[PDB]
């Protein structure tokens, strides 16, 4: 449900991009391309949309900070559900993360 291809396309060039005005244009061009989404992936990819605006605002370390605290949710007294929706948010944070990474190689 997490880490999806328009996702992960929309974190790359939004890392790449070095203006954050230059990144909320990118942003907007995701929510412009949303509509053509497949609903069951657009209502992930929506959410994942705030979820970039979030880290635009908070920066770059936000997500990195929201990923360990995840992984502090995940080692705890969760149910099944919970467990499940914290992958989901690993996964989706750990992509960003993850095009990160490659940004800083190229």
Known sequence: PGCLPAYDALAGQFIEASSREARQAI???????????????????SQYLKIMGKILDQGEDFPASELARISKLI?????????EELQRSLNILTAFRKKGAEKEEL
């Open 75 to 83: 080692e705890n007294k969760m149910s099944e559900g919970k467990k």
């Open 27 to 45: 942003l907007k061009q995701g929510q412009d391309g949303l509509s053509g989404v497949k609903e069951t992936d657009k209502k992930w990819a």
